[PDB]
Design an enzyme around this catalytic site. Structure first.
Site, PDB file in Angstrom:
ATOM      1  N   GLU A 116       0.835  -1.190   0.000  1.00 49.56           N
ATOM      2  CA  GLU A 116       0.000   0.000   0.000  1.00 49.56           C
ATOM      3  C   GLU A 116       0.867   1.237   0.000  1.00 49.56           C
ATOM      4  OE1 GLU A 116      -2.950   0.373  -0.438  1.00 49.56           O
ATOM      5  OE2 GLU A 116      -4.146  -1.281   0.369  1.00 49.56           O
TER       6      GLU A 116
ATOM      7  N   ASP B 270      -6.778   2.309  -7.949  1.00 49.23           N
ATOM      8  CA  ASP B 270      -5.480   2.398  -7.272  1.00 49.23           C
ATOM      9  C   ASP B 270      -4.506   1.455  -7.963  1.00 49.23           C
ATOM     10  OD1 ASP B 270      -6.818   0.093  -5.371  1.00 49.23           O
ATOM     11  OD2 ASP B 270      -4.661  -0.047  -5.170  1.00 49.23           O
TER      12      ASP B 270
HETATM   13 ZN   LIG Z   1      -5.949  -1.306  -4.092  1.00 51.12          ZN
END
Ligand SMILES: [Zn+2]
EC number: 3.5.1.28
Length: 179
Positions: free
Chosen positions: A116, A164
């Site tokens: 992340e 993302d």
């Molecule tokens: Zn993601």
């Protein structure tokens, strides 16, 4: 950096209950790149640590109640300042990819690590994060060879659903630092 077979010494271990066995204890190959910030648009809170452990407080924020129904986690996080936080040993299965798909094969959780990047789809990530992401990646590539030949966004294994790590993510900058 160095690998204690699953764990990154340099990091700040958050013992997330949110992992389990990789099916048939298959070893990871594909690394997926994630993004996240909580509340969405701020950085530095404790709240990510929170979501990733299944304890976050739905009352802490009108956006936290919307997702306080998930149990989710991502192998590691890179904070805006380079700080690496690890929730789950790399060899284990992180609750990160979700309903995903890479090369005929779904439930990408099974075979992937998830990193992340604290940030947003639209705001440049920081220098430290490119330096750190690449740092961790080289390590895992040494432990797991296939990674160098399997790297992707969440947005790739889950179009429409995920965006993302976003058009912000300059793969050029990152790859420039992987082995
Ligand atoms: Zn993601």
């Amino acid at each position: 950096m160095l690998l204690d077979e699953g764990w990154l010494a340099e990091a700040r271990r958050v013992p997330s209950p949110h992992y389990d066995c990789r099916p048939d204890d298959e070893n990871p190959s594909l690394l997926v790149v994630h993004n996240i910030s909580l509340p969405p648009g701020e950085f530095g809170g404790p709240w990510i640590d929170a979501l990733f452990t299944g304890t976050i407080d739905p009352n802490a924020h009108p956006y936290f109640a919307g997702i306080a129904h998930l149990r989710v986690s991502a192998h590691c996080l890179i904070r805006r300042d380079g700080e690496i936080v690890q929730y789950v040993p790399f060899d284990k299965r992180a609750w990160h990819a979700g309903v995903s798909s890479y090369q005929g094969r779904e439930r990408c959780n099974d075979f992937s690590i998830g990193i992340e990047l604290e940030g947003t789809d639209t705001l440049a990530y920081t220098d430290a994060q490119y330096q750190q992401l690449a740092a961790v990646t080289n390590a895992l590539i040494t432990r797991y060879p296939a990674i160098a030949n399997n790297m992707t966004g969440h947005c790739n294994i889950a179009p429409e659903r995920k965006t993302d790590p976003g058009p912000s993510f300059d793969w050029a900058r990152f790859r420039a630092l992987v082995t």
